Amino acid sequence: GMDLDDHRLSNTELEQKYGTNIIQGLSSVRATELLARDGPNTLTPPKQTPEIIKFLKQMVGGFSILLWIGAALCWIAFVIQYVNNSASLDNVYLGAILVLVVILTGIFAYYQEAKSTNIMASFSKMIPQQALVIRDAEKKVISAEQLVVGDVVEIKGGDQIPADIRLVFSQGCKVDNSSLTGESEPQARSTEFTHENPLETKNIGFYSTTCLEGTATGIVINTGDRTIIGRIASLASGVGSEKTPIAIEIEHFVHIVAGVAVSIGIIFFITAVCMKYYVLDAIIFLISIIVANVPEGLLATVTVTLSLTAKRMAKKNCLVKNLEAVETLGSTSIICSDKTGTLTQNRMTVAHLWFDNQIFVADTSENQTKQAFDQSSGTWASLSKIITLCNRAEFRPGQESVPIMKRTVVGDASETALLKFSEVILGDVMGIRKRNHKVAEIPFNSTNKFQLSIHETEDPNNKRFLVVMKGAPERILEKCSTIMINGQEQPLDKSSADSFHTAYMELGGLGERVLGFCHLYLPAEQFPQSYIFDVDSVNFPTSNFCFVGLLSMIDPPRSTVPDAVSKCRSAGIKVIMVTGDHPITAKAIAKSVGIISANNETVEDIAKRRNIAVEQVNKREAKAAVVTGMELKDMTPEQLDELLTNYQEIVFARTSPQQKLIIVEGCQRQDAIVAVTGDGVNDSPALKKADIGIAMGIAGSDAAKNAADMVLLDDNFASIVTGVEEGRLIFDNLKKTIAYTLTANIAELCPFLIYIVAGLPLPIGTITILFIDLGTDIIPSIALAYEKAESDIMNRKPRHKKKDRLVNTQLAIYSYLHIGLMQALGGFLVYFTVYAQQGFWPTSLINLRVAWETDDINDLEDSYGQEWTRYQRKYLEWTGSTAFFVAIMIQQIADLIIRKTRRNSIFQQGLFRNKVIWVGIASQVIVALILSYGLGSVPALSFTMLRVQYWFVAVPHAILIWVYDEMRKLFIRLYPGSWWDKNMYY
Amino acid sequence: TGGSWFKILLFYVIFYGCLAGIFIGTIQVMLLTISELKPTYQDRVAPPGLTQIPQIQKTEISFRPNDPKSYEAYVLNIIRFLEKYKDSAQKDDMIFEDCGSMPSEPKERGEFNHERGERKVCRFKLDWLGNCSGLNDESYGYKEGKPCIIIKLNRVLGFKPKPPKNESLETYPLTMKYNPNVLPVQCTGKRDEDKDKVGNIEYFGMGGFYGFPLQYYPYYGKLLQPKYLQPLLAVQFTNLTLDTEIRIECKAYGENIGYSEKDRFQGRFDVKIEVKS
Ligand SMILES: CCCCCCCC/C=C/CCCCCCCC(=O)OC[C@H](COP(=O)(O)OCC[N+](C)(C)C)OC(=O)CCCCCCC/C=C/CCCCCCCC
Ligand SMILES: CCCCCCCC/C=C\CCCCCCCC(=O)OC[C@H](COP(=O)(O)OCC[N+](C)(C)C)OC(=O)CCCCCCC/C=C\CCCCCCCC
Ligand SMILES: CC(C)CCC[C@@H](C)[C@H]1CC[C@H]2[C@@H]3CC=C4C[C@@H](O)CC[C@]4(C)[C@H]3CC[C@]12C
Ligand SMILES: CC(C)CCC[C@@H](C)[C@H]1CC[C@H]2[C@@H]3CC=C4C[C@@H](O)CC[C@]4(C)[C@H]3CC[C@]12C
Ligand SMILES: *[C@@H]1O[C@H](CO)[C@@H](O)[C@H](O)[C@H]1NC(C)=O
Ligand code: ALF
Ligand SMILES: [K+]
Ligand SMILES: [K+]
Ligand SMILES: [Mg+2]
């Protein structure tokens, strides 16, 4: 409802506005009235449509409307026949089969469709139950849902904030805002208006976040869905009712096929009416047109191939929640990627350490066990003992089995990072810490800005007190007067200070937090081994230390992220970085993972290098762009569009959860399919808005996993690369399968048009072609989904979502007007062969069907003068139909062989390399054998047993199909861009 | 562009012309196999069907003798069929021959070849169809309660019917058989109810024999034997119950003759006759 915050207001005006008091809180008689007026502090669940309605919507999706019309026409034809006593139950069987086809395709489509899951349950780990509010000047432990605006609530370290509160009294309060920024770094809270942005003003406590430590008092300012997390969840749930690109392509293909069917139906219905035909023949012919023109089994096979690829991917730790998401990778133009936890290990580790005036680099992998950076020299043993001695962090016991880098440790980020580094390089560091009995004085403070500790060395011959003090590099330098170089305590001069400052600047220029380390050997003469120390700093020196080194921590990228980003960019995909972290760290991570290339520069970098101002330099030289949330919030959509178009390497830093969604929407309006990778609650609206959203398994939140279309169960971007490859392969194989099915559609359609025009006896029945659709052509179409790539999948650019369709005009015309007609010709050759060998020459069959189908005539005369009864005529008609069916099967075997490739040849692709195609060929042959010599041994469903020679009459036509396709692809290969690749390639 | 349109029309005209040429070439190569004298196979026609002349709609003959319009269609169909059996039509001696008036052996006229050209055909006289030739009674028996149907065996090229042997008494004896060279035909009510209302059926065949004489077989197939006349057997139901619909089944008998439950006209009739008062 309201989207503004009130943090510029002090206690008095807030009390006047919200009508409350800090001390007395609110009276219950007013608290309950306000609660009734506004509502409980609860998140409203979305409106989930019933599953039955979704299941029923699939019965009118795709080609189901045409099949329902066909079933209705079958019922009407059956009743017309029943009135006139000439009924054979064949239309009832056709209608029942069509209804069954609709039911099965609807079931498969329901399974394919993305499941709508609510996101409220993913916020249950947040959203506390009990709140410490004060009413009528006494504190009461009332539930969170009973809060209302104006109430005064206290928070304690370790609990969840009961609502969006504005702090009034705070005592060293720290909060974790990982749900708003994706960064778990503890944020200091106070009562001071610090920043213009409400999300970063340090005196606002947010609903569903956790208070790490301290104690704070505040006034509730937002309740329920009016809170930050409330709008985050509202965006995550409400938005996202869009179709996947493969769904759009399938819908376009269905539109093309339905248009063809309807146009031919109207035209040939007019031709039938004009040729003096009554109603029954016209409606039966329209039924035949519908049954021939609709691919009855194609969509279910599409779903089966999608599920096969989904389970193959799931075998590699890549969980596909939504089946259609297996294709969205591939045809993806832009990847908008979160940084922390997604491109980054979300672990704070040491990267660089500077000592002996030299900068050494340490390995930052999550599996590294030992690292070498010239440790044999001096000045490093002292540094390592400073790391161990001046470190408070402790492992949790019982973690011997788990490796070092995965061990859970108590402490802050820097303390744990130093502990992990020491435990890695030095080995067992608990024993060394145990040896030197540390004095109870270990002063650390948010204001002192240094960590101090005094230890006594356990060397048997030395037994000398050694003090260690670490902290911020400037506070470190001002508290020292010498430096350690090769073990010599050389005094720190002006040049040494300048070199230290240069190293500090270089380390800070990589987005690394830097710590200083120094020590001093307290003399035994003034500090014997019988001296007691006081925490009041009244008996030990806090100055004149010996500087040693400078370590820095980075929160580094994952091991397999840089090369995966490189492969994704080499596949033509733009990789955009959208993170809630600070700009410096974001830019450093982008350069480390290759999102911003080393050669490329940003406007600020160029201006600094040229010693000029940012305004002076034009912006065409800089190929990179780092954009903060403040800069983007003022940008109009036009400026955002120009920013996306002009720059190829873009980094958006310090972005709110709504700003990620805005960036995604800006990318999508560029006619692009965009993928979002995330692992946090703040990424959920962007994940749900994206065409495909990818979450991380180990590092991901429940909300991110629920909002995503895909989950990386092992946190590897190589899964993203393999998903792109698999999606592009799926697109190619879908093209092949669709062409293979359309060919059979036309091969089925042509006999009925010839039957209406020339007047021949029915070349093939309508029931027979249903066995083509749901019989011999089910397993070959699945087998075509197992084809390997004909070229480099990754070298190709992403396809344009508008200019590159799954089914284009070339595919449809080549399947309809080239290969389907050839199959019809072969079938008609076999049909005329069957009829002529029994007595009817081809010209005697023209305009014969009216007398042929007349039950009155039982002495119809053939070409030799013999007389035929009606049953013998219909048996010969069934035999011709069965021969036509077998011919279509043989030419579909040839079609299966030629559709194996779109440019290559079977000599190059390999005829026997894909064994699933040979399984499918065996399926075609076996199904035809069962339907001819099984069902057909008894005459049923217009099937009969054929003579052996009728199985091979159409073989040369199949060879001709193969030769024609081989020649087409050979000449496509020889002369690219020669009117032939443009007019004959699909 | 215009050049692209010209090329894409020329490709399609050439492609479709090539496809049509290949199709017609395959059809001609196939047709080279078959002959104009005899069919390659007789898997369907070999057991001949039995059909009647009036060519009725729903296996029903229904007429009122008072109204000539009721039986006019039946009579006209019989006239149309028998127009070629007139003595005027079979006058020539070059094409027709005066075959013996008593039943004889099947008359082989050589094997199926273009040699000897047009074969000769035996002539069939309407006089053998007494009460049903139409020579004396132009309306056959429809004016009275005497419906007349004419039975004919379906022409099958090179088919020689072999009459049933004396292994068993196939039905109630005809007592005038000449079984070596006569193919018997018997009409009886399908049910016991019809057998009590069918009446006295009088057959009319060549030589006074109740069936098809064998000197008309084999048939040589509309090329060697045009104007061939198949033998006929007139059947008349003199006394049948009025206003009742009687079911009649007529069968042919022989070793070579076969019957099918699926095909109701393979060697059998199922005709329904009613005569309204
Ligand atoms: C997309 C759909 C594709 C499929 C289209 C199906 C088209 C359906 C049309 C059917 C009409 C008949 C077609 C076949 C014609 C065969 C010609 C023929 O021979 O018939 C047989 C008769 C008599 O034979 P016989 O006794 O001498 O043989 C005895 C054997 N022996 C010679 C050895 C002694 O001969 C004669 O009556 C010859 C005198 C009559 C000639 C009529 C010519 C009509 C031909 C039409 C063909 C059209 C092809 C269209 C292709 C389109 C491609 C896109
Ligand atoms: C006896 C009966 C026998 C019947 C046999 C079958 C006859 C029909 C067989 C094949 C025809 C299939 C036609 C499919 C056409 C799909 C049209 C289409 O939208 O496809 C998509 C792609 C790209 O489209 P886009 O992004 O540029 O469109 C954007 C325009 N927006 C935004 C308004 C959508 O199309 C492309 O690949 C670029 C090419 C687009 C060409 C426009 C469509 C006209 C092409 C063919 C129509 C005539 C075919 C020949 C008829 C033969 C009669 C015998
Ligand atoms: C000889 C006859 C059969 C040729 C008929 C050609 C017809 C069937 C083809 C040619 C062009 C095709 C159209 C091309 C473009 C569109 C727009 C799309 O949004 C829906 C499909 C639709 C509407 C197609 C329907 C089918 C179509 C009209
Ligand atoms: C049966 C014969 C005569 C039909 C003749 C008309 C045919 C050849 C013409 C008419 C319309 C034409 C199509 C119109 C649109 C396109 C889309 C384009 O991207 C490639 C060419 C293509 C695919 C044309 C191919 C040739 C075409 C199909
Ligand atoms: C039928 O033939 C018989 C015997 O020749 C004859 O007596 C009878 O008159 C004929 N029927 C009629 C009414 O023509
Ligand atoms: F994990 Al983030 F922005 F880097 F939500
Ligand atoms: K179909
Ligand atoms: K999504
Ligand atoms: Mg994250």
Residue numbers in the entry:
A (entry chain A): 51 to 1036
B (entry chain B): 28 to 304
In the authors' words:
Here we study primary-active transport via P-type ATPases using functional and structural analyses to demonstrate that four simultaneous residue substitutions transform the non-gastric H+/K+ pump, a strict H+-dependent electroneutral P-type ATPase, into a bona fide Na+-dependent electrogenic Na+/K+ pump. P-type 2C ATPases are obligatory heterodimers formed by a catalytic α subunit and a auxiliary β subunit. While the sodium pump is electrogenic, generating an electric current as it extrudes three Na+ and imports two K+ per ATP hydrolyzed (black ions), the gHKA and ngHKA export H+ and import K+ in an electroneutral fashion (cyan ions). The exquisite ion selectivity and stoichiometry characteristics of these pumps are determined by their ion-binding sites, formed between transmembrane helixes TM4-TM8 of the catalytic subunit.
Mutagenesis pinpointed Lys794 as the critical residue for ngHKA’s electroneutrality because its mutant Lys794Ala, and to a lesser extent Lys794Glu, are electrogenic. The Cryo-EM structures of Lys794Ala and Lys794Ser in the K+-bound E2-Pi were solved at 2.80 and 2.99 Å resolution, respectively. The global structures of these mutants were indistinguishable from WT − ngHKA. Lys794Ala displays one strong spherical density at site II (valence 0.86), representing K+, and few weaker densities around site I, where we modeled waters. Thus, Lys794Ala electrogenic transport differs from NKA. While the alanine mutant mediates electrogenic transport of 2Na+ or 2H+ for 1K+, the NKA-mimicking serine mutant mediates electroneutral transport of 2Na+ or 2H+ for 2K+. Asp945 forms a salt bridge (dotted lines) with Arg949 in the E2-Pi structures of WT-, K794A-, and K794S-ngHKA. Mutation of lysine 794 to serine or alanine reduces the ion selectivity of ngHKA, as both mutants can be activated by either Na+ or H+, but neither single substitution suffices to flip selectivity.
